[PDB]
């Protein structure tokens, strides 16, 4: 039997599903450690690897990309879990190796691939503490091209009044996503700063794992795919909205939870964001 992870319900994705919107025809690039394309609860439509030592983007030695992918678009069926956008078109853009790490050069190549292949949404559940002009340039290029780019805010916790949001979440062109639990409480590891845009569930998030199994992880890495999936739901209902419109609706209709330094605009509400 199929289970719906709490986070899917917490962002009100089922309301869109009931309206008949599940992300159909929206192309979502999972820029991560690959996706186990053999998982029976995933449908991976394409992809590409930019890790020199791992030419196969459809094998995931880390599990990170496969878990992220399941939160975005685990299939609606008789097994496993259910994604935010279970009909979305998933693409495995491998820029991280089996250790779950990668160089910015690999990541940049993945974003370029997403642009060249006309992706609608980019999920980047990754980041580092140091900036990069080349990274900012390609991320801005993706946004100017019309792509919705969601990025994990970071797992560095809080440090007084200083921002701990990492890159590329720190860039204004990306949606920086923090993590809350099922009570809408901020996770203590969730990075904070003026760059934080929204929150999504990121504690004990059940999703798909390589080998056809399932398991729970914590991180802003897990919160980000809720926003990527939400953007895919919004585009399946409003195919003409620009990425700027999609972003504005996700942020402005969020459920305020408190100090924006720690919570941004609050918890995304895709039901309110997608209201005609």
Name every residue whose Cβ is closer than 8 Å to that of residue 32 and which is 6 or more positions away in sequence: 64, 65, 68, 69, 92, 93, 94, 95, 96, 123, 124, 125, 126
Q: Tell me: does residue 178 bind Ca ion (CB under 5 A).
A: no
Q: Which one, 42 or 231, has the nearer CB to Ca ion? A: 42
Residue nearest to Ca ion (CB): 221
Q: Tell me: does residue 54 bind Ca ion (CB under 5 A).
A: no
3-state secondary structure of 51: strand
Name every residue whose Cβ is closer than 8 Å to that of residue 258 and which is 6 or more positions away in sequence: 266
Q: Tell me: does residue 80 bind Ca ion (CB under 5 A).
A: yes
Q: Which one, 126 or 246, has the nearer CB to Ca ion? A: 126
Q: Are 165 and 196 in contact (CB under 8 A)?
A: yes
Q: Tell me: does residue 2 bind Ca ion (CB under 5 A).
A: yes
Considering the complex, what minimum distance in angstroms separates the CB of residue 2 from Ca ion? 5
Q: Which one, 35 or 75, has the nearer CB to Ca ion? A: 75
Considering the complex, what minimum distance in angstroms separates the CB of residue 191 from Ca ion? 12
Q: Which one, 95 or 115, has the nearer CB to Ca ion? A: 95
Among 77, 137, 159, 242, binds Ca ion (CB under 5 A): 77
What pairs with residue 148 in β-bridges? Answer: 121
* Gap between the Cα atoms of 92 and 36, Å rounded: 9
* Gap between the Cα atoms of 71 and 172, Å rounded: 25
Binding mask 198-227 for Ca ion (x = CB under 5 A): ---------------------x-x------
Q: Tell me: does residue 233 bind Ca ion (CB under 5 A).
A: no
């Amino acid at each position: 039997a199929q289970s719906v992870p709490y986070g899917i319900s917490q962002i009100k994705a089922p309301a869109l599903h009931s309206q008949g919107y599940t992300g159909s025809n929206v192309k979502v690039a999972v820029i991560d450690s690959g996706i186990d394309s053999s998982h029976p609860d995933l449908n991976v439509r394409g992809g590409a690897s930019f890790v020199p030592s791992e030419t196969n983007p459809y094998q995931d030695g880390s599990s990170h990309g496969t878990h992220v992918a399941g939160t975005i678009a685990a299939l609606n069926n008789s097994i496993g879990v259910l994604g935010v956008a279970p009909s979305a078109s998933l693409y495995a853009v491998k820029v991280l190796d089996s250790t779950g790490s990668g160089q910015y050069s690999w990541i940049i190549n993945g974003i370029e691939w997403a642009i060249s292949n006309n992706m609608d949404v980019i999920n980047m559940s990754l980041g580092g503490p140091s900036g990069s002009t080349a990274l900012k340039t390609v991320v801005d290029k993706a946004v100017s091209s019309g792509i919705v780019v969601a990025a994990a805010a970071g797992n560095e916790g809080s440090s007084g009044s200083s921002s701990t949001v990492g890159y590329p979440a720190k860039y204004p062109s990306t949606i920086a996503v923090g993590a809350v639990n099922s009570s809408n409480q901020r996770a203590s590891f969730s990075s904070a700063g003026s760059e934080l845009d929204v929150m999504a569930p990121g504690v004990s998030i059940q999703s798909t794992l390589p080998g056809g199994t399932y398991g729970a992880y914590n991180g802003t890495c897990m919160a980000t795919p809720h926003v990527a999936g939400a953007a895919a739901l919004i585009l399946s209902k409003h195919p003409t909205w620009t990425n700027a419109q999609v972003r504005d609706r996700l942020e402005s209709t969020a459920t305020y939870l408190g100090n924006s330094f720690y919570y941004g605009k609050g918890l995304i509400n895709v039901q309110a964001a997608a209201q005609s």
